[PDB]
């Protein structure tokens, strides 16, 4: 079997991407943020604290003939940005673009932090990292991908994110019409539960490529590209007037600038991120200071190949017994 669903940016900056997911019987369609950096499928629901719901579509397990309470199970998660959510768990039928998993753990939110409440477009998250990161206690649960894997034609999913445009998540197959050239595959470490790999280097604009190992994760659930301070300083030093601002929380640059591209290595292959992908617009409405799409990973403890990097490529998340990541230009 296979699945194919369209993913759409939530706003004019590609702050996050939402993909429709059918849950329960009859179907309840929720727009979830597919996140390769976490492993919990959680939704806003009829159990979410009323004051923490602002325009989201909620899952109501009582209206689903296939919903079953996963007795005694709870979940609690905190993300890298400081956001968090927690609640209880149901099992129900979940379909993504025609691909169905029966008995999938659907984590119902009882509480969500302010960032989730304020994002009216995001009805929940669908985790796609390794199931070892799942927060369900006392019985850890599998991701939608882990549960579907044995039914898939190929044990893979692909992310093809758009730049200010819709894109696609495919499960179980590689769409050979969605990329140019060949897909370069690279080794993955599952030791920290992420799609963790090692980039072979970088170039800034038309500069010479620097061969250097950069360990990091392929994370669809992170907006920006977070790399070592040395790399990030080298990039921003090419933009007149750019600087790191502690009051803003990162590198900013004059909105009047035309940004250089950023190239990252995948083995002997190269993925070029166009300069326009690195512009996140004014820091505040009407400001002439713009926020950079390449930021330092210094306070994080891990480099993150977020949407800024992933949307420049067709990306294969290969969940075979030896997991790998594939990158192709498009
Ligand atoms: N990295 C996971 C994640 C996804 C979305 C959000 C936000 F912005 F919607 F709250 C925060 C964190």
Structure description:
The chain has about 325 residues and is mainly beta. It has two domains: about 5-175, no CATH class; about 175-330, no CATH class. It is built from four helices and 24 strands. Strands 18-17-12-13-22-14-21 form a seven-stranded mixed beta sheet. The longest helix is centred in the C-terminal third of the chain and has 8 residues, at about 230-235. The two termini are about 25 Å apart. Bound molecules: [4-(trifluoromethyl)phenyl]methanamine (U1H). [4-(trifluoromethyl)phenyl]methanamine (U1H) binds near residues 81, 221 and 222.
SSE layout and pairings?
Layout: E1 3-9, E2 17-23, E3 28-35, E4 41-43, E5 68-78, E6 84-96, E7 99-112, H1 114-118, E8 124-127, H2 144-148, E9 156-160, E10 167-171, E11 184-187, E12 196-204, E13 210-218, E14 225-227, H3 229-236, E15 243-245, E16 250-254, E17 262-266, E18 269-273, E19 279-282, E20 289-292, E21 294-296, E22 304-305, H4 307-310, E23 313-318, E24 324-329
Parallel strand pairs: 3-8, 4-7, 13-22, 14-21
Antiparallel strand pairs: 1-2, 1-10, 2-3, 2-6, 4-8, 5-6, 6-7, 9-10, 9-23, 11-24, 12-13, 12-17, 14-22, 15-16, 16-20, 17-18, 19-20, 23-24
The structure holds [4-(trifluoromethyl)phenyl]methanamine (U1H).
PDB class: hydrolase
Keywords: Endopeptidase, hydrolase, room temperature
Assembly: monomeric
């Amino acid at each position: 079997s296979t699945g194919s669903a369209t993913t759409t940016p939530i706003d004019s900056l590609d702050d996050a991407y939402i993909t429709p997911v059918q849950i329960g019987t009859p179907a309840q369609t929720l727009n979830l943020d597919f996140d390769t950096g976490s492993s919990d499928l959680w939704v806003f629901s009829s159990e979410t604290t009323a004051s923490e719901v602002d325009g989201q579509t909620i899952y109501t397990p009582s209206k689903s003939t296939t919903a079953k309470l996963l007795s005694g199970a709870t979940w609690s998660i905190s993300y890298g940005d400081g956001s968090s959510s927690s609640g209880d768990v149901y099992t129900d039928t979940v379909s993504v673009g025609g691909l169905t998993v029966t008995g999938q753990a659907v984590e119902s939110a009882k509480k969500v932090s302010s960032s989730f409440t304020e994002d009216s477009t995001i009805d929940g998250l669908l985790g796609l990292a390794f199931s070892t990161l799942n927060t369900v206690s006392p019985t850890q649960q599998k991701t939608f991908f882990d549960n579907a894997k044995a039914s898939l034609d190929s044990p893979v999913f692909t992310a093809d994110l758009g730049y200010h445009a819709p894109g696609t998540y495919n499960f179980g197959f590689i769409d050979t019409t969605a990329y140019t050239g060949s897909i370069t595959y690279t080794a993955v470490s599952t030791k920290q539960g992420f799609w963790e790999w090692t980039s072979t280097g970088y170039a800034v604009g038309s500069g010479t490529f620097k061969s250097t190992s950069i360990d990091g994760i392929a994370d669809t659930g992170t907006t920006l590209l977070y790399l070592p301070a040395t790399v990030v300083s080298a990039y921003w030093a090419q933009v007149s007037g750019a600087k790191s601002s502690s009051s803003v929380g990162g590198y900013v640059f004059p909105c009047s600038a035309t940004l250089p591209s950023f190239t990252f290595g995948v083995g002997s292959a190269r993925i070029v991120i166009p300069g326009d992908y690195i512009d996140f617009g004014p820091i505040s409405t009407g400001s002439s200071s713009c926020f950079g799409g390449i930021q330092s990973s210094a306070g994080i403890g891990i480099n993150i190949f977020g949407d800024v990097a992933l949307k420049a490529a067709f990306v294969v998340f290969n969940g075979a017994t030896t997991p790998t990541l594939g990158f192709a230009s498009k």
